[model samples]
Target: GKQGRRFDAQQYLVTSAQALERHYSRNGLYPASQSLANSPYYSFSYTPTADKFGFSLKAVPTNRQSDPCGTLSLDHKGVRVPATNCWSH
Candidate 1:
């Protein structure tokens, strides 16, 4: 599975650059940044080695509510995440 799915950094960068370009095309960079600044579901983070684009909400009880297993957990009240990954990155 790992070998079949390789990490394509260049492709990702190209896509990111294109999206940024499009965002800056209409209004400006500031507006683009502001529009995406406080997104709860799709935020962007960039580092020297990597760039992240999507929701990375910290594991608190208030983020999850619906479990695919269809079990309304009584003891668990906060964000209802899967039991297999009670803690994840």
Candidate 2:
């Protein structure tokens, strides 16, 4: 006999930014920023480091002095680096 854990939640949410865009629009594709503003959970930013990159999932700050932990969309590619790849565009 195989036993697997089955879990369920009272409230299920689609947190994917891309999925949220489709939920809002009826047709065609649109640019969806994976920013924290787009999601209710948190905003994510990728900042480049000296040799690698870092990730920061926190409240979006207006202060430009704050350095992002990871590198996101670039040249319209939307995180297309070797390690930062994610978006389709």
Candidate 3:
């Protein structure tokens, strides 16, 4: 038998961003930039713009913190485009 990875973390984040967009469109609220500031393992951002939406996630080390490798932006239709740092991985 062959093996296949059934889960994709990057895609999961994209789906979550899509869901966030839906909520924003329906309820007219956007998550604050530092909503996940307290989190130690990861950081997140969600921004809703007049023409497009933006979301990002980055890993944070216990000893220090830094910017995420990339971002996932969604269009009005929930389609995603990879941000600059996304291609390195």
Candidate 4:
């Protein structure tokens, strides 16, 4: 049960990275005022360790510091489905 869930999460992250890379290759780095599909453009933090790339995002806060965002890590290995309670660097 848990194994299947983990697999799905990891696949999702890997595919997401592929799509992002493709877009970056064609359009270059995203503009600060750019928006995709009428939605806000989300940014990612990158980390390279060993032979893998780690991409992470901080959860959106509800109201300033009232609601701290959680951390979600997506790497070449897999996605952290249940993101940890930490902020991205």
Candidate 5:
């Protein structure tokens, strides 16, 4: 139950980033709209590359069930290498 919601928020960010990348690859630019989905457990913030080559996204949980993981982030590489907080919990 604990692992479920935390990973739900984590994968949500990753999944949404895929949407950004898919559009960029096909359209040749990142979508300017920053609107993203929300969940009972978490919310999100997005940053686009000024030049449109890449983008960054962060998902922060509002509930303690999703804590200790801190915040999760994803970028152009589609991999959470180490931009912010724990991608691990």
Candidate 6:
């Protein structure tokens, strides 16, 4: 149960990152921070860099998925320091 929830949290974070990137690449700008379509694990936060070219995103957990995952962070460069399981969506 614990491990499964952790995996879900991590994947959601990466999926959110991918969504943001696609918005930037396809729309030429990162859309205002948006939440996942149907998620109950984390709140997605997005802060666009200058001109909205790049951005900083975080998957803030609202459940026990915070154990070892913590707040998963991902940058426009696809870089991450999520503590353990994520960032290669």
User: Which one wins on lDDT?
Assistant: 5
Q: Each model's TM-score, in the order given?
A: 0.28, 0.22, 0.35, 0.39, 0.76, 0.65
lDDT for each residue of candidate 2 in 12-47, tens digit (9 for 90 to 100): 112333343453366343333333332232244423
- Cα-based lDDT at residue 82, candidate 1: 41
Tens-place lDDT per residue, model 3, 1-89, is 00011113344445566666666688665444424332343444455453434434432222233334333343445444454434322
Better-scoring candidate (TM-score), 2 or 6: 6
lDDT of predicted model 2: 0.27
**Number of the top candidate by TM-score?**
5
Where does candidate 1 stray beyond 4 Å?
A: 1-7, 30-44, 47-89
lDDT of 6 by residue, 10-88 (tens): 5776777877777877888887666654346666676777687777777676764555656777787878766445444
User: Local error of candidate 2 at 83, Å?
Assistant: 2.0
Q: Which prediction has more favorable TM-score, 4 or 5?
A: 5
Predicted candidate 5 versus true structure: per-residue lDDT over 1-89, tens digit per residue: 65577667667777788788789889999987668887766778888888888888887767554466666777877768444555552
Which wins on TM-score, candidate 1 or candidate 4? 4
Q: Write the per-residue lDDT of candidate 4 for residues 1-89, one digit (tens) a residue.
A: 33333333344445556665555567654222212121121223444443323334222222222323322355434455355643222
Q: Which stretch of 10 consecutive residues in model 4 shows the poorest summed lDDT?
A: 33-42
Residue-pair clash count for candidate 4? 0
Weakest 10 consecutive residues, lDDT, candidate 6?
80-89
Off by over 4 Å in 4: 30-72, 75-89
Candidate 6 global CA lDDT score: 0.68
The clash count for each model shown is 4, 7, 0, 0, 0, 0
Clashing pairs in 3: none
Candidate 2: segments with Cα more than 4 A from true spot: 1-16, 31-69, 73-89
Cα displacement (Å) at residue 18, model 5: 1.6
Flag regions of model 3 displaced more than 4 Å: 1-7, 32-55, 59-85
